[PDB]
Subunit: 359 residues, 4 copies
Amino acid sequence: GERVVINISGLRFETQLKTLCQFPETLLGDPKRRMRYFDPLRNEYFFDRNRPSFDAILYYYQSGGRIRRPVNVPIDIFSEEIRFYQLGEEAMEKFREDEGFLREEERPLPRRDFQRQVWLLFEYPESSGPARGIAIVSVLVILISIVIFCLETLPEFRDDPFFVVETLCIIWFSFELLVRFFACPSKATFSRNIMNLIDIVAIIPYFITLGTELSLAILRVIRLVRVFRIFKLSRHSKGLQILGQTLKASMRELGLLIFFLFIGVILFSSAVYFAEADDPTSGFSSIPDAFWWAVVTMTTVGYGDMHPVTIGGKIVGSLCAIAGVLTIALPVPVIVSNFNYFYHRETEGEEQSQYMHVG
Amino acid sequence: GERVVINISGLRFETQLKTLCQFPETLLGDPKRRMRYFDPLRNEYFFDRNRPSFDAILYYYQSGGRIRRPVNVPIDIFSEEIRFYQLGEEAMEKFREDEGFLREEERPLPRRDFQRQVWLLFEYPESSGPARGIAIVSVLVILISIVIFCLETLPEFRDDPFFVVETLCIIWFSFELLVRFFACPSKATFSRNIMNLIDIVAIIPYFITLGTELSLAILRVIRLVRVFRIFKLSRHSKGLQILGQTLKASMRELGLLIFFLFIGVILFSSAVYFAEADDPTSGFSSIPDAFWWAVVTMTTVGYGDMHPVTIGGKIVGSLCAIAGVLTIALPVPVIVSNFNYFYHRETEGEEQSQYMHVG
Amino acid sequence: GERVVINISGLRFETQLKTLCQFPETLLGDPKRRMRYFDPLRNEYFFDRNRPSFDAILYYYQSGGRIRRPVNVPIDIFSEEIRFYQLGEEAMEKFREDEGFLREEERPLPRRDFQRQVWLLFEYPESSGPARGIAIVSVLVILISIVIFCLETLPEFRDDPFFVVETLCIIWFSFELLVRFFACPSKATFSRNIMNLIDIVAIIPYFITLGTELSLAILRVIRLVRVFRIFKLSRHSKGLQILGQTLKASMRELGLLIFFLFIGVILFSSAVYFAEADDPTSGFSSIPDAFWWAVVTMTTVGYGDMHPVTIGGKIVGSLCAIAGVLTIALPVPVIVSNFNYFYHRETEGEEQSQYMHVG
Amino acid sequence: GERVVINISGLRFETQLKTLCQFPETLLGDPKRRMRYFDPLRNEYFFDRNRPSFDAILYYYQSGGRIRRPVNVPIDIFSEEIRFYQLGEEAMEKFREDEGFLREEERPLPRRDFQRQVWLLFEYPESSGPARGIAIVSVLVILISIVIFCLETLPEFRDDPFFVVETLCIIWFSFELLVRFFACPSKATFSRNIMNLIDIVAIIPYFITLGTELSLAILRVIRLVRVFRIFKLSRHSKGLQILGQTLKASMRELGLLIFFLFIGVILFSSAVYFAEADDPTSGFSSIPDAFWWAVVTMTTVGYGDMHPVTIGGKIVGSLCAIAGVLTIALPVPVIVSNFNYFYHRETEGEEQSQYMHVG
């Protein structure tokens, strides 16, 4: 009912007493903690603290829980004022998701001594010595395997000695498969994180080769999954994580690029067909034939096998070359801004934020 | 004449009384509403409200109606303060066009039960069940029709069976034509929204084929309007609306791109002509011939049929390749900023704004 | 010596009296103008004006003349407060060059009635009726002339009838030359504005043809100045003015682009020479020969006449293709930001600024 | 224990006295300097200074040394207030590294009269007359030498007269080598600055030619270091310094570009191999052969020697052309922002900052 006066180093704030009695745990809401800040000659509380920061602390009492931050006060100064006014760890955690820095995820443990030794030994290569030694050999097994796959597709050998070279890798592809299937917090959550479901498609398509030798169009595609062994490098590369979430945060913005271009692939190929169908020398036999000419011009690749020849086709091709810029440059800066939003918060993100946030 | 003191939680404001008597309907302007906020021991009115928000509410009384917003206070907080001070729905609507979020347009009704059932059934596919079922079939009729037009221009059949395939579509192009011509709020405003005038050019150029078979250069162009059937997909695509307004907001900024390039198409073709006219092997027969070489180089497409050969032409072509970047990259970022201005206010625009604006 | 208190609607400011006595013409500095704002019950001056705007007006008295503007207060509100406090037209003009909007240039007059009629008739086409009629015919004379120059270089006529076509233009190129040489504020300043010195190079190189027919390498270049007739279109085009100042504000930033690329033209051509000199089939005869290959790859034009063939040249050409992006994309966004700085202040610039600035 | 009141032109600040007694050298902390600002009728100190600037000066006393700056107050105004309040040269230097402008590096001297004359004569060409005359001749020695190296690789002379032309340069490459080796502050720090270690690789690879004439694959590469003579131009070019630090500040961001592309060079070449291996006419013999096709398409260079022919390869090449944009445009704007961060602070950087910072 009655009101209180709070004097933050010369700046006067006046709220009713019952507003501070919403949160009877904090500094301002507990009548025995603030009694050493009272000033009986002026009937007010004097804090020699930051001036522009208390305007946000007062709003947390009035709004009932919303923690904002003014532009002037930095992160390392506003975080101390939450610690000084004792707003609580629920109030402190609201400064996380307001700012954008997400909390750390607690990892489950296999509640033993054997499986708790080997879980932190391979999943967390920064733990121990051979944990750093298991990472420096896990980069080789994929890197040799992508090279011999590049070496198997060489025309010197295609036009079994390499079988002892590849089985040197797949048993190591089983060696990290076997020791990780059963050492996990739960087999359920081991089948959720996509970084290992993709790895078992490096052991199945080699295994289907053995059952088939001991349907020819299938035999090409089951060696095509041997190009997916380059996706295992995302385990030991921080950059592909940032590229990984960039597409993962732009499922829709990529589909708007493909749809925006595909109208022009229909439109300009049909426009150059109806201006170059009157020529026995013109290569444009069909609109299905002229689909390749469109996507090369709008991407400004410009091969030079296909050529418009009449004057009506060259003005069609001129407007196709201009509109390829505008049908590409519009959706893509939201993909650069999505990438930098993830690039910032991984290499320089939690080095200033969480250093003075959690405490 | 006399002045009043308003105390917004410790911050004192003092205006004359006649300034509050400009708007004798609101909270501060009505002498029986504010009488429960008076403080007879200090001769002032005490509000325990947001501090930096009242600086904008006070300016609305002084300026006579202008509603601004400080940078600090968000949209969801400044909107409550207009609701608390009871500034009025005309004052609340000024927070719309100041912020930029435009009001919703009221749609007219055909004041019946038959035509009011069928107006909301096809124009508003989110209304009912078969309203969502009429949209999933309206995407097929255009999509098959663009495919058979691509299939009619195949060279396997050109070098009537397809007539029963296309008339399967045009009667459906009449089926959405017929039921929408007469079910409308007014036939006048049905002929204003361009999304249906373009649709009737998918029934007229097929109809001119029938009168002509039952002038050869006209027969090509009346099949050229069968490429305009891809423009009907903007009815069931939110993305082409955003691309649609992007060109619609940059009629002038596109014409500055075409004019800026076209000076270089004249200039560099004339410069490479006067350095390569001294060669019987040079392909550059004319400045009308060298127009095609210019627009390919400045767009960095680079076909490779045309080749400058002398040393004087290669330095001309070098400056043509550099200046193609600067004659393209300058006008286009105002077209990316116009696109993102419409991209933001359609998918994430009214999800934070109007959720706490209208009330 | 003594101090004054100024109360801007509840906010108290206190300066010494001698600070207001620096500028004894304004409202606060003149002791008979502010005497109707005095408040003898509080010993202060009460203004019911804008609160955050007076913090900048007070700094103008303390600093001795510097007029700033806070971020919060707009242009149309801060301009009224200078008008209300009567700071003066010298103080008002300091709000121009602080904000960036330059003053209008006063044009000189030929102090007569004949020459003052004809000066505003052609230089200012927005003056009268035929002033708009002289602009619609001044666009034709250059546009026909650029076409017949394009038509003279046609190979149908080169491989005198066109002389009566071109002299139809050059006498009109004399008709705007003659009536503007002598109608001017001064013949001195008529020879300074570059928009007419360039026009007289459309009458001299045609005139040298007549003295020579009534040295063959000169005869080509004196028809090469007939491509400079496209530069006269900047008189009746607002866009080329903005492009004109963009290069005119980036003399240095263009030279940093040409120098940055030219290191790569030396470097990669020498690197591909030393990896492809071991081949009788390689086209790269010299580093002067491989200069053309470098500038085509780094600009991503990619003709396709020149081809690296050995494996050592393809890895050289791969790094040449990547580094062409970084040797182009770095200097150019300061040229887009210079263009938009001039694009904004010509079509939408003085429509909000000077509408409430000068008064 | 007791508190003081400071009145910055109407704005009241109140801190305890012991907070000002942390820094007993400044104006507020020294009880004989502030005694002429006291006001015995109000028991406070009155300063007629800038209002929003003292909120940052007060925080320097409370935080114990941190000097911030509000957004409102400029650099030339906040710097005067540090000078007026006498915060000290250690406090003044904290305004440097907070703002970002680094201090000037003191150069060592050879403590003589001979070597101190010649150190400032060549390293500092802005010192004297012939110091500007030694720079205008130091640009020629490298520029002729890069030309005769371009002239030695001409095919008119390769398919000794030029030896007296090149030794005219290398003795001048010794003339700036000899006079700078021994005139330095220390021979240790002369071997640290990379701008001269690179210069001595313009005298060693010519010297190995003399020992070998008075191993053929070495003879090519020791003339390949004669392309490194273009790197000496960074001594007399301010622009290459800014490009020099741009790569020097993006060692990691360049490696993320090469790694991001190289996944696509593996992926799409393997995808176009498995769709074009079924053709005797297809040029794609191997994935090592198709590596060149990938990096040309993703960079949108598009030579035109290699051509996908089947329909399955053209849809593979279409997605390769699109994804080349997204595998290039993502890392590069952090390299444009790193370049402009160095471009700003060298030509317009210390012209506003240090003009009113150091004093």
